[model samples]
Target: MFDSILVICTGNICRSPIGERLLRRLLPSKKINSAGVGALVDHTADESAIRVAEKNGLCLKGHRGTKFTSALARQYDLLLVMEYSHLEQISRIAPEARGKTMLFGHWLDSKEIPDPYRMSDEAFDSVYQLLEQASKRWAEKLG
Candidate 1:
Protein backbone atom coordinates (compact mmCIF):
# COMPACT_ATOMS: atom_id res chain seq x y z
CA MET A 1 0.00 0.00 0.00
CA PHE A 2 1.45 3.36 -1.15
CA ASP A 3 4.68 1.55 -1.85
CA SER A 4 5.26 2.96 -5.28
CA ILE A 5 5.34 6.72 -5.96
CA LEU A 6 5.88 8.84 -9.04
CA VAL A 7 6.90 12.50 -9.09
CA ILE A 8 5.62 14.62 -11.94
CA CYS A 9 6.78 18.04 -13.09
CA THR A 10 7.04 19.94 -16.36
CA GLY A 11 10.44 19.14 -17.83
CA ASN A 12 11.44 16.56 -15.23
CA ILE A 13 14.74 18.41 -15.29
CA CYS A 14 14.03 20.62 -12.34
CA ARG A 15 11.49 20.01 -9.58
CA SER A 16 10.69 16.31 -9.89
CA PRO A 17 14.30 15.15 -9.83
CA ILE A 18 15.00 16.81 -6.51
CA GLY A 19 11.61 15.87 -5.12
CA GLU A 20 12.13 12.26 -6.13
CA ARG A 21 15.57 12.12 -4.58
CA LEU A 22 14.45 13.65 -1.30
CA LEU A 23 11.58 11.20 -1.06
CA ARG A 24 13.90 8.38 -2.06
CA ARG A 25 16.19 9.18 0.83
CA LEU A 26 13.44 9.65 3.37
CA LEU A 27 11.36 6.71 2.19
CA PRO A 28 14.08 4.32 1.16
CA SER A 29 11.74 1.37 1.56
CA LYS A 30 9.46 2.63 -1.16
CA LYS A 31 9.83 2.37 -4.93
CA ILE A 32 10.03 5.87 -6.42
CA ASN A 33 10.68 7.61 -9.74
CA SER A 34 9.91 10.88 -11.55
CA ALA A 35 8.60 11.87 -14.97
CA GLY A 36 7.35 14.92 -16.89
CA VAL A 37 4.21 15.73 -18.78
CA GLY A 38 6.24 17.50 -21.44
CA ALA A 39 9.59 15.92 -20.81
CA LEU A 40 12.70 16.72 -22.72
CA VAL A 41 12.65 12.93 -23.09
CA ASP A 42 16.00 11.34 -22.26
CA HIS A 43 17.38 14.73 -21.29
CA THR A 44 19.26 14.95 -18.06
CA ALA A 45 18.21 17.16 -15.19
CA ASP A 46 18.79 20.83 -15.95
CA GLU A 47 22.08 22.36 -14.92
CA SER A 48 20.65 24.50 -12.15
CA ALA A 49 18.66 21.61 -10.65
CA ILE A 50 21.69 19.35 -10.87
CA ARG A 51 23.87 21.97 -9.26
CA VAL A 52 21.39 22.61 -6.44
CA ALA A 53 21.04 18.87 -5.78
CA GLU A 54 24.81 18.53 -5.59
CA LYS A 55 25.00 21.38 -3.12
CA ASN A 56 22.58 19.47 -0.90
CA GLY A 57 24.52 16.17 -1.27
CA LEU A 58 22.10 14.64 -3.72
CA CYS A 59 23.72 13.68 -6.99
CA LEU A 60 21.31 13.57 -9.94
CA LYS A 61 23.67 12.36 -12.66
CA GLY A 62 21.81 9.17 -13.46
CA HIS A 63 18.43 10.75 -13.70
CA ARG A 64 16.97 11.16 -17.16
CA GLY A 65 13.79 12.90 -18.23
CA THR A 66 10.88 10.56 -18.83
CA LYS A 67 7.57 11.32 -20.47
CA PHE A 68 4.37 10.84 -18.52
CA THR A 69 2.03 8.21 -19.88
CA SER A 70 -1.09 6.42 -18.79
CA ALA A 71 0.89 3.21 -18.40
CA LEU A 72 3.62 4.89 -16.42
CA ALA A 73 1.07 6.62 -14.18
CA ARG A 74 -0.69 3.30 -13.54
CA GLN A 75 2.56 1.67 -12.48
CA TYR A 76 2.89 3.89 -9.46
CA ASP A 77 0.80 3.59 -6.33
CA LEU A 78 0.86 7.39 -6.04
CA LEU A 79 1.39 10.29 -8.42
CA LEU A 80 2.56 13.61 -7.01
CA VAL A 81 2.37 16.66 -9.21
CA MET A 82 3.93 20.13 -8.89
CA GLU A 83 0.74 22.17 -9.18
CA TYR A 84 -3.00 21.96 -8.64
CA SER A 85 -3.56 21.97 -12.39
CA HIS A 86 -1.50 18.86 -12.75
CA LEU A 87 -4.09 17.02 -10.74
CA GLU A 88 -6.43 17.52 -13.66
CA GLN A 89 -3.64 16.93 -16.13
CA ILE A 90 -2.97 13.48 -14.73
CA SER A 91 -6.66 12.77 -14.68
CA ARG A 92 -6.82 13.54 -18.37
CA ILE A 93 -3.72 11.61 -19.28
CA ALA A 94 -4.57 8.65 -17.11
CA PRO A 95 -8.19 8.61 -16.19
CA GLU A 96 -7.54 5.65 -13.95
CA ALA A 97 -4.96 7.55 -11.93
CA ARG A 98 -7.22 10.53 -11.28
CA GLY A 99 -7.94 9.47 -7.77
CA LYS A 100 -4.38 8.53 -6.97
CA THR A 101 -2.86 11.73 -8.37
CA MET A 102 -2.29 14.66 -6.04
CA LEU A 103 -0.26 17.79 -5.43
CA PHE A 104 3.38 17.21 -4.49
CA GLY A 105 2.86 20.26 -2.35
CA HIS A 106 -0.21 18.72 -0.76
CA TRP A 107 1.35 18.90 2.66
CA LEU A 108 2.38 22.47 1.92
CA ASP A 109 -1.24 23.51 2.19
CA SER A 110 -1.94 22.48 -1.37
CA LYS A 111 0.73 24.86 -2.56
CA GLU A 112 1.70 25.05 -6.17
CA ILE A 113 5.40 24.64 -6.83
CA PRO A 114 6.01 27.01 -9.70
CA ASP A 115 8.32 26.12 -12.58
CA PRO A 116 11.72 27.76 -12.44
CA TYR A 117 13.10 26.55 -15.73
CA ARG A 118 15.50 29.00 -17.40
CA MET A 119 14.54 31.49 -14.77
CA SER A 120 17.64 31.80 -12.61
CA ASP A 121 19.86 29.81 -10.30
CA GLU A 122 18.12 31.45 -7.39
CA ALA A 123 14.78 30.31 -8.74
CA PHE A 124 16.09 26.78 -8.93
CA ASP A 125 17.36 27.07 -5.38
CA SER A 126 13.98 28.37 -4.26
CA VAL A 127 12.10 25.52 -5.87
CA TYR A 128 14.63 23.09 -4.43
CA GLN A 129 13.90 24.30 -0.93
CA LEU A 130 10.16 24.04 -1.53
CA LEU A 131 10.52 20.50 -2.84
CA GLU A 132 12.75 19.60 0.07
CA GLN A 133 10.19 20.78 2.60
CA ALA A 134 7.28 19.19 0.77
CA SER A 135 9.09 15.87 0.45
CA LYS A 136 9.75 15.79 4.17
CA ARG A 137 6.09 16.41 4.91
CA TRP A 138 5.05 13.58 2.60
CA ALA A 139 7.56 11.29 4.29
CA GLU A 140 6.15 12.16 7.66
CA LYS A 141 2.65 11.39 6.47
CA LEU A 142 3.56 8.28 4.49
CA GLY A 143 6.54 6.97 6.37
Candidate 2:
Protein backbone atom coordinates (compact mmCIF):
# COMPACT_ATOMS: atom_id res chain seq x y z
CA MET A 1 0.00 0.00 0.00
CA PHE A 2 1.11 3.60 -0.70
CA ASP A 3 0.99 6.57 1.60
CA SER A 4 1.30 9.40 -0.89
CA ILE A 5 -0.62 9.63 -4.16
CA LEU A 6 -0.76 11.90 -7.21
CA VAL A 7 -3.84 12.33 -9.39
CA ILE A 8 -3.25 13.03 -13.08
CA CYS A 9 -5.54 14.31 -15.85
CA THR A 10 -5.48 16.57 -18.91
CA GLY A 11 -5.85 19.74 -16.86
CA ASN A 12 -5.15 20.31 -13.18
CA ILE A 13 -8.21 22.55 -13.08
CA CYS A 14 -11.04 20.11 -13.65
CA ARG A 15 -11.13 16.39 -13.07
CA SER A 16 -7.79 16.05 -11.34
CA PRO A 17 -8.43 18.75 -8.75
CA ILE A 18 -11.79 17.27 -7.84
CA GLY A 19 -10.27 13.82 -7.60
CA GLU A 20 -7.44 15.16 -5.48
CA ARG A 21 -9.78 16.77 -2.99
CA LEU A 22 -12.11 13.79 -2.84
CA LEU A 23 -9.26 11.40 -2.24
CA ARG A 24 -7.83 13.62 0.44
CA ARG A 25 -11.18 13.75 2.20
CA LEU A 26 -11.73 10.01 1.87
CA LEU A 27 -8.21 9.05 2.92
CA PRO A 28 -7.33 11.78 5.34
CA SER A 29 -4.15 10.11 6.45
CA LYS A 30 -2.75 9.78 2.98
CA LYS A 31 -0.90 12.54 1.13
CA ILE A 32 -2.82 13.45 -2.02
CA ASN A 33 -1.73 15.77 -4.83
CA SER A 34 -2.87 16.47 -8.41
CA ALA A 35 -1.40 17.65 -11.74
CA GLY A 36 -2.23 17.85 -15.41
CA VAL A 37 -0.63 15.89 -18.19
CA GLY A 38 -0.82 18.97 -20.42
CA ALA A 39 -1.64 21.72 -18.00
CA LEU A 40 -1.50 25.42 -18.82
CA VAL A 41 1.43 25.73 -16.42
CA ASP A 42 0.04 28.04 -13.74
CA HIS A 43 -3.68 28.29 -14.26
CA THR A 44 -6.40 27.99 -11.67
CA ALA A 45 -9.05 25.30 -11.71
CA ASP A 46 -11.76 26.12 -14.26
CA GLU A 47 -14.74 28.09 -12.99
CA SER A 48 -17.06 25.25 -13.81
CA ALA A 49 -15.00 22.89 -11.69
CA ILE A 50 -15.15 25.22 -8.73
CA ARG A 51 -18.89 25.74 -9.10
CA VAL A 52 -19.69 22.08 -9.43
CA ALA A 53 -17.49 20.96 -6.56
CA GLU A 54 -18.80 23.74 -4.35
CA LYS A 55 -22.38 22.76 -5.18
CA ASN A 56 -21.55 19.26 -4.06
CA GLY A 57 -20.00 20.50 -0.79
CA LEU A 58 -16.40 19.86 -1.78
CA CYS A 59 -13.80 22.60 -1.45
CA LEU A 60 -11.13 23.14 -4.08
CA LYS A 61 -10.07 26.61 -2.98
CA GLY A 62 -6.39 25.82 -2.67
CA HIS A 63 -5.97 24.13 -6.03
CA ARG A 64 -3.50 25.52 -8.56
CA GLY A 65 -2.26 24.11 -11.86
CA THR A 66 0.70 21.82 -12.08
CA LYS A 67 2.22 19.93 -14.97
CA PHE A 68 3.32 16.33 -15.02
CA THR A 69 7.07 16.41 -14.80
CA SER A 70 9.74 13.83 -14.15
CA ALA A 71 10.50 15.42 -10.80
CA LEU A 72 6.84 15.44 -9.82
CA ALA A 73 6.47 11.82 -10.89
CA ARG A 74 9.27 10.75 -8.60
CA GLN A 75 7.67 12.37 -5.55
CA TYR A 76 4.62 10.15 -5.24
CA ASP A 77 4.34 6.61 -4.01
CA LEU A 78 1.35 6.11 -6.28
CA LEU A 79 -0.15 7.83 -9.31
CA LEU A 80 -3.88 7.65 -9.99
CA VAL A 81 -4.65 8.83 -13.50
CA MET A 82 -8.08 9.88 -14.74
CA GLU A 83 -7.88 8.04 -18.06
CA TYR A 84 -6.10 5.23 -19.91
CA SER A 85 -4.37 7.63 -22.27
CA HIS A 86 -2.90 9.47 -19.29
CA LEU A 87 -1.34 6.24 -18.10
CA GLU A 88 0.31 5.82 -21.48
CA GLN A 89 1.72 9.35 -21.45
CA ILE A 90 2.96 9.03 -17.89
CA SER A 91 4.63 5.77 -18.87
CA ARG A 92 6.62 7.47 -21.59
CA ILE A 93 7.53 10.48 -19.44
CA ALA A 94 8.34 8.59 -16.28
CA PRO A 95 8.88 4.93 -16.92
CA GLU A 96 10.01 4.52 -13.31
CA ALA A 97 6.41 5.27 -12.38
CA ARG A 98 5.15 2.16 -14.19
CA GLY A 99 4.37 0.05 -11.16
CA LYS A 100 3.24 3.09 -9.21
CA THR A 101 0.84 4.58 -11.76
CA MET A 102 -2.72 3.36 -12.07
CA LEU A 103 -6.20 4.52 -12.93
CA PHE A 104 -8.20 6.27 -10.16
CA GLY A 105 -10.83 3.67 -10.97
CA HIS A 106 -8.37 0.81 -10.51
CA TRP A 107 -10.66 -0.93 -8.08
CA LEU A 108 -13.58 -0.49 -10.44
CA ASP A 109 -12.36 -2.73 -13.25
CA SER A 110 -10.02 -0.04 -14.57
CA LYS A 111 -12.74 2.45 -15.46
CA GLU A 112 -11.73 5.80 -16.93
CA ILE A 113 -12.95 9.09 -15.47
CA PRO A 114 -14.17 11.12 -18.39
CA ASP A 115 -13.26 14.82 -18.72
CA PRO A 116 -16.02 17.36 -18.16
CA TYR A 117 -14.33 20.56 -19.31
CA ARG A 118 -16.39 22.82 -21.58
CA MET A 119 -19.44 20.64 -20.95
CA SER A 120 -22.86 21.59 -19.60
CA ASP A 121 -23.71 21.79 -15.89
CA GLU A 122 -25.57 18.48 -16.08
CA ALA A 123 -22.58 16.85 -17.70
CA PHE A 124 -20.27 18.20 -15.00
CA ASP A 125 -22.66 16.91 -12.37
CA SER A 126 -22.59 13.48 -13.94
CA VAL A 127 -18.80 13.46 -14.02
CA TYR A 128 -18.66 14.63 -10.41
CA GLN A 129 -20.94 11.77 -9.35
CA LEU A 130 -18.75 9.27 -11.14
CA LEU A 131 -15.66 10.68 -9.45
CA GLU A 132 -17.29 10.50 -6.05
CA GLN A 133 -18.20 6.88 -6.60
CA ALA A 134 -14.71 6.03 -7.76
CA SER A 135 -13.04 7.94 -4.95
CA LYS A 136 -15.22 6.18 -2.40
CA ARG A 137 -14.26 2.84 -3.87
CA TRP A 138 -10.61 3.82 -3.71
CA ALA A 139 -10.97 4.66 -0.03
CA GLU A 140 -12.58 1.28 0.62
CA LYS A 141 -9.91 -0.52 -1.37
CA LEU A 142 -7.07 1.29 0.30
CA GLY A 143 -8.51 0.73 3.71
Candidate 3:
Protein backbone atom coordinates (compact mmCIF):
# COMPACT_ATOMS: atom_id res chain seq x y z
CA MET A 1 0.00 0.00 0.00
CA PHE A 2 1.27 3.49 -0.91
CA ASP A 3 1.62 5.86 1.99
CA SER A 4 2.83 9.07 0.38
CA ILE A 5 2.62 10.54 -3.09
CA LEU A 6 4.52 13.38 -4.73
CA VAL A 7 3.23 15.32 -7.68
CA ILE A 8 5.86 16.97 -9.85
CA CYS A 9 6.19 19.51 -12.63
CA THR A 10 8.73 22.10 -13.80
CA GLY A 11 8.14 25.01 -11.41
CA ASN A 12 6.09 23.47 -8.56
CA ILE A 13 4.49 26.90 -8.64
CA CYS A 14 1.99 25.80 -11.22
CA ARG A 15 0.95 22.37 -12.46
CA SER A 16 2.38 20.39 -9.57
CA PRO A 17 0.64 22.50 -6.95
CA ILE A 18 -2.71 22.01 -8.64
CA GLY A 19 -2.11 18.29 -8.86
CA GLU A 20 -1.08 18.20 -5.21
CA ARG A 21 -4.24 19.98 -4.09
CA LEU A 22 -6.51 17.69 -6.08
CA LEU A 23 -4.72 14.61 -4.84
CA ARG A 24 -5.06 15.86 -1.29
CA ARG A 25 -8.80 16.22 -1.74
CA LEU A 26 -9.16 12.85 -3.41
CA LEU A 27 -6.79 10.91 -1.20
CA PRO A 28 -7.12 12.72 2.09
CA SER A 29 -5.61 9.89 4.13
CA LYS A 30 -2.42 9.85 2.12
CA LYS A 31 0.35 12.39 2.57
CA ILE A 32 0.25 14.20 -0.76
CA ASN A 33 2.80 16.87 -1.64
CA SER A 34 4.67 18.33 -4.60
CA ALA A 35 7.98 19.72 -5.89
CA GLY A 36 9.59 21.08 -9.03
CA VAL A 37 12.44 19.76 -11.05
CA GLY A 38 13.94 23.26 -11.42
CA ALA A 39 11.92 25.17 -8.89
CA LEU A 40 12.20 28.87 -8.23
CA VAL A 41 12.91 27.85 -4.63
CA ASP A 42 10.97 29.81 -2.03
CA HIS A 43 8.56 31.05 -4.65
CA THR A 44 4.82 30.66 -4.23
CA ALA A 45 2.47 29.12 -6.70
CA ASP A 46 2.14 31.00 -9.99
CA GLU A 47 -0.64 33.58 -9.95
CA SER A 48 -2.39 31.91 -12.84
CA ALA A 49 -2.35 28.55 -11.08
CA ILE A 50 -3.82 30.17 -7.99
CA ARG A 51 -6.59 31.86 -9.93
CA VAL A 52 -7.54 28.73 -11.82
CA ALA A 53 -7.56 26.52 -8.74
CA GLU A 54 -9.55 29.08 -6.79
CA LYS A 55 -12.17 29.24 -9.53
CA ASN A 56 -12.32 25.48 -9.40
CA GLY A 57 -12.69 25.49 -5.57
CA LEU A 58 -9.15 24.45 -4.70
CA CYS A 59 -6.49 26.42 -2.83
CA LEU A 60 -2.78 26.83 -3.46
CA LYS A 61 -2.37 29.29 -0.60
CA GLY A 62 -0.06 26.89 1.24
CA HIS A 63 2.00 25.90 -1.77
CA ARG A 64 5.66 26.79 -2.19
CA GLY A 65 8.36 25.79 -4.61
CA THR A 66 10.94 23.24 -3.51
CA LYS A 67 13.83 21.75 -5.39
CA PHE A 68 13.72 18.08 -6.31
CA THR A 69 16.55 16.12 -4.67
CA SER A 70 17.51 12.54 -3.97
CA ALA A 71 16.51 13.00 -0.34
CA LEU A 72 13.17 14.51 -1.36
CA ALA A 73 12.91 11.74 -3.91
CA ARG A 74 12.92 9.09 -1.20
CA GLN A 75 9.94 10.62 0.59
CA TYR A 76 7.31 9.45 -1.85
CA ASP A 77 5.75 6.01 -2.34
CA LEU A 78 4.54 7.24 -5.73
CA LEU A 79 5.87 10.02 -7.96
CA LEU A 80 3.30 11.33 -10.43
CA VAL A 81 4.74 13.73 -12.98
CA MET A 82 3.43 15.86 -15.84
CA GLU A 83 5.78 14.73 -18.54
CA TYR A 84 8.35 12.23 -19.74
CA SER A 85 11.05 14.85 -19.30
CA HIS A 86 10.34 14.89 -15.58
CA LEU A 87 10.64 11.13 -15.30
CA GLU A 88 13.97 11.33 -17.11
CA GLN A 89 15.22 14.07 -14.81
CA ILE A 90 14.16 12.32 -11.60
CA SER A 91 15.59 9.07 -12.87
CA ARG A 92 19.00 10.67 -13.30
CA ILE A 93 18.87 12.21 -9.84
CA ALA A 94 17.48 9.10 -8.18
CA PRO A 95 17.43 6.01 -10.27
CA GLU A 96 15.52 4.25 -7.53
CA ALA A 97 12.63 6.58 -8.21
CA ARG A 98 12.24 5.21 -11.70
CA GLY A 99 10.08 2.43 -10.39
CA LYS A 100 7.89 4.87 -8.54
CA THR A 101 7.75 7.64 -11.15
CA MET A 102 4.59 7.63 -13.24
CA LEU A 103 3.02 9.79 -15.88
CA PHE A 104 0.03 11.71 -14.55
CA GLY A 105 -1.54 11.09 -17.90
CA HIS A 106 -0.61 7.41 -17.95
CA TRP A 107 -4.18 6.16 -18.35
CA LEU A 108 -4.77 8.71 -21.06
CA ASP A 109 -2.42 6.98 -23.47
CA SER A 110 0.81 8.34 -22.08
CA LYS A 111 -0.15 11.88 -23.02
CA GLU A 112 2.15 14.62 -21.82
CA ILE A 113 0.45 17.26 -19.70
CA PRO A 114 1.64 20.47 -21.26
CA ASP A 115 3.04 23.23 -19.08
CA PRO A 116 1.24 26.55 -18.88
CA TYR A 117 3.89 28.50 -16.97
CA ARG A 118 3.74 31.95 -18.53
CA MET A 119 0.70 31.41 -20.62
CA SER A 120 -2.62 33.19 -20.29
CA ASP A 121 -5.30 32.29 -17.73
CA GLU A 122 -7.10 30.33 -20.41
CA ALA A 123 -4.05 28.19 -20.93
CA PHE A 124 -3.74 27.52 -17.23
CA ASP A 125 -7.42 26.57 -17.20
CA SER A 126 -6.78 24.12 -19.99
CA VAL A 127 -3.95 22.59 -18.04
CA TYR A 128 -6.10 22.36 -14.91
CA GLN A 129 -8.80 20.56 -16.83
CA LEU A 130 -6.20 18.08 -17.97
CA LEU A 131 -4.94 17.69 -14.42
CA GLU A 132 -8.49 17.06 -13.21
CA GLN A 133 -8.92 14.23 -15.67
CA ALA A 134 -5.55 12.76 -14.83
CA SER A 135 -6.08 13.03 -11.10
CA LYS A 136 -9.40 11.23 -11.42
CA ARG A 137 -7.65 8.46 -13.29
CA TRP A 138 -5.05 8.25 -10.55
CA ALA A 139 -7.71 8.07 -7.84
CA GLU A 140 -9.42 5.27 -9.68
CA LYS A 141 -6.14 3.37 -9.64
CA LEU A 142 -5.91 3.87 -5.89
CA GLY A 143 -9.44 2.52 -5.47
Candidate 4:
Protein backbone atom coordinates (compact mmCIF):
# COMPACT_ATOMS: atom_id res chain seq x y z
CA MET A 1 0.00 0.00 0.00
CA PHE A 2 1.18 3.54 -0.72
CA ASP A 3 1.72 5.61 2.37
CA SER A 4 2.83 8.82 0.71
CA ILE A 5 1.88 10.62 -2.47
CA LEU A 6 3.26 13.66 -4.30
CA VAL A 7 1.29 15.88 -6.64
CA ILE A 8 3.27 17.61 -9.38
CA CYS A 9 2.70 20.25 -12.06
CA THR A 10 4.55 22.90 -14.09
CA GLY A 11 4.41 25.48 -11.32
CA ASN A 12 3.51 24.59 -7.75
CA ILE A 13 1.39 27.73 -7.71
CA CYS A 14 -1.24 26.16 -9.92
CA ARG A 15 -2.40 22.59 -10.38
CA SER A 16 -0.26 20.65 -7.91
CA PRO A 17 -1.24 22.75 -4.92
CA ILE A 18 -4.90 22.23 -5.65
CA GLY A 19 -4.37 18.54 -6.27
CA GLU A 20 -2.37 18.14 -3.08
CA ARG A 21 -5.02 19.74 -0.93
CA LEU A 22 -7.86 17.83 -2.58
CA LEU A 23 -6.04 14.55 -2.21
CA ARG A 24 -5.27 15.31 1.41
CA ARG A 25 -8.94 15.92 2.07
CA LEU A 26 -9.84 12.65 0.36
CA LEU A 27 -7.10 10.53 1.94
CA PRO A 28 -6.69 12.11 5.34
CA SER A 29 -4.80 9.10 6.62
CA LYS A 30 -2.13 9.36 3.95
CA LYS A 31 0.74 11.77 3.49
CA ILE A 32 0.13 13.97 0.49
CA ASN A 33 2.34 16.85 -0.68
CA SER A 34 2.99 18.85 -3.85
CA ALA A 35 5.91 20.40 -5.78
CA GLY A 36 6.67 21.58 -9.26
CA VAL A 37 9.08 20.64 -12.01
CA GLY A 38 9.64 24.35 -12.60
CA ALA A 39 8.17 25.82 -9.47
CA LEU A 40 7.81 29.42 -8.54
CA VAL A 41 9.73 28.66 -5.39
CA ASP A 42 8.42 30.23 -2.20
CA HIS A 43 5.38 31.49 -4.04
CA THR A 44 1.81 30.95 -2.94
CA ALA A 45 -0.93 29.36 -5.00
CA ASP A 46 -2.08 31.39 -7.99
CA GLU A 47 -4.91 33.83 -7.43
CA SER A 48 -7.18 31.94 -9.78
CA ALA A 49 -6.47 28.70 -7.98
CA ILE A 50 -7.09 30.27 -4.60
CA ARG A 51 -10.43 31.61 -5.73
CA VAL A 52 -11.67 28.30 -7.03
CA ALA A 53 -10.37 26.35 -4.07
CA GLU A 54 -12.09 28.78 -1.74
CA LYS A 55 -15.33 28.33 -3.65
CA ASN A 56 -15.10 24.59 -3.02
CA GLY A 57 -14.24 25.02 0.67
CA LEU A 58 -10.61 24.00 0.28
CA CYS A 59 -7.99 26.26 1.79
CA LEU A 60 -4.90 27.18 -0.19
CA LYS A 61 -3.54 29.76 2.16
CA GLY A 62 0.13 29.83 3.18
CA HIS A 63 1.09 27.29 0.57
CA ARG A 64 4.64 28.15 -0.46
CA GLY A 65 5.79 26.44 -3.64
CA THR A 66 8.65 23.99 -3.65
CA LYS A 67 10.72 22.73 -6.51
CA PHE A 68 10.74 19.05 -7.37
CA THR A 69 14.00 17.36 -6.51
CA SER A 70 15.43 13.86 -6.57
CA ALA A 71 15.50 13.81 -2.78
CA LEU A 72 11.81 14.74 -2.61
CA ALA A 73 10.96 12.20 -5.28
CA ARG A 74 12.66 9.45 -3.29
CA GLN A 75 10.37 10.07 -0.33
CA TYR A 76 7.00 9.40 -1.95
CA ASP A 77 5.35 6.10 -2.76
CA LEU A 78 3.62 7.71 -5.71
CA LEU A 79 3.93 10.87 -7.80
CA LEU A 80 0.74 12.12 -9.43
CA VAL A 81 1.54 14.58 -12.19
CA MET A 82 -0.74 17.01 -14.00
CA GLU A 83 0.59 16.26 -17.45
CA TYR A 84 2.53 13.57 -19.31
CA SER A 85 5.51 15.87 -19.72
CA HIS A 86 5.74 16.24 -15.95
CA LEU A 87 6.25 12.48 -15.72
CA GLU A 88 9.17 12.76 -18.11
CA GLN A 89 10.62 15.67 -16.12
CA ILE A 90 10.38 13.83 -12.81
CA SER A 91 11.91 10.71 -14.30
CA ARG A 92 14.78 12.78 -15.60
CA ILE A 93 15.39 14.22 -12.12
CA ALA A 94 15.07 10.92 -10.31
CA PRO A 95 15.30 7.86 -12.47
CA GLU A 96 14.05 5.71 -9.61
CA ALA A 97 10.76 7.65 -9.55
CA ARG A 98 9.73 6.49 -12.99
CA GLY A 99 7.97 3.48 -11.58
CA LYS A 100 5.97 5.50 -9.09
CA THR A 101 4.92 8.40 -11.30
CA MET A 102 1.48 8.55 -12.89
CA LEU A 103 -1.10 11.08 -14.01
CA PHE A 104 -3.46 12.57 -11.41
CA GLY A 105 -6.33 11.80 -13.75
CA HIS A 106 -5.35 8.16 -13.95
CA TRP A 107 -8.94 6.94 -13.72
CA LEU A 108 -10.41 9.71 -15.84
CA ASP A 109 -11.17 9.48 -19.53
CA SER A 110 -8.60 12.18 -20.37
CA LYS A 111 -5.94 10.99 -17.95
CA GLU A 112 -4.53 14.52 -17.83
CA ILE A 113 -5.41 17.78 -16.09
CA PRO A 114 -4.61 21.00 -17.82
CA ASP A 115 -3.08 23.96 -15.99
CA PRO A 116 -5.44 26.87 -15.45
CA TYR A 117 -2.95 29.48 -14.32
CA ARG A 118 -3.62 33.01 -15.59
CA MET A 119 -6.78 31.67 -17.12
CA SER A 120 -10.39 32.63 -16.60
CA ASP A 121 -12.48 31.78 -13.55
CA GLU A 122 -14.32 29.36 -15.78
CA ALA A 123 -11.09 27.58 -16.60
CA PHE A 124 -10.15 27.28 -12.95
CA ASP A 125 -13.60 25.97 -12.16
CA SER A 126 -13.30 23.35 -14.85
CA VAL A 127 -9.90 22.23 -13.60
CA TYR A 128 -11.17 22.09 -10.03
CA GLN A 129 -14.07 19.86 -11.07
CA LEU A 130 -11.68 17.50 -12.81
CA LEU A 131 -9.34 17.42 -9.85
CA GLU A 132 -12.19 16.81 -7.47
CA GLN A 133 -13.36 13.83 -9.49
CA ALA A 134 -9.85 12.49 -9.87
CA SER A 135 -9.17 12.91 -6.15
CA LYS A 136 -12.33 10.98 -5.32
CA ARG A 137 -11.34 8.14 -7.61
CA TRP A 138 -7.88 8.00 -6.08
CA ALA A 139 -9.23 8.07 -2.55
CA GLU A 140 -11.49 5.08 -3.26
CA LYS A 141 -8.75 3.11 -5.00
CA LEU A 142 -6.08 3.90 -2.46
CA GLY A 143 -8.20 3.68 0.64
Clashes of each: 0, 0, 0, 0
lDDT of 3 by residue, 1-143 (tens): 88899888888899988999998899899999999888989999998899999999998996779888888879889999899888889889889988988888888764789999999999988999999998998999997
- Candidate 2 — what's its lDDT? 0.89
Q: Per-residue lDDT for 2-31 in model 1, tens only?
A: 999999998999999889999999998899
Considering every candidate listed, which one attains the maximal lDDT?
4
Which ranges in model 3 have alpha carbons more than 4 Å from their true place? none
lDDT of 4 by residue, 1-143 (tens): 79999999988998989999998888888888999999999998999899999999999987999999999988899999999888888778989998988999999999989878889999999999999999999888996
Order of candidates by lDDT, top first? Answer: 4, 1, 3, 2
TM-score head-to-head 1 vs 2, winner: 1
Determine the C-alpha RMSD for candidate 2 after optimal superposition of all C-alphas: 1.2
Cα lDDT of model 4 overall?
Answer: 0.91
How high is the lDDT of residue 104 in model 1?
Answer: 92
Cand. 4 TM to true fold = 0.97
Clashing pairs in 3: none
lDDT of candidate 2 at residue 86, scale 0 to 100 = 90
lDDT for each candidate structure: 0.90, 0.89, 0.89, 0.91
- Candidate RMSDs in Å, in order, are 1.0, 1.2, 1.0, 0.8
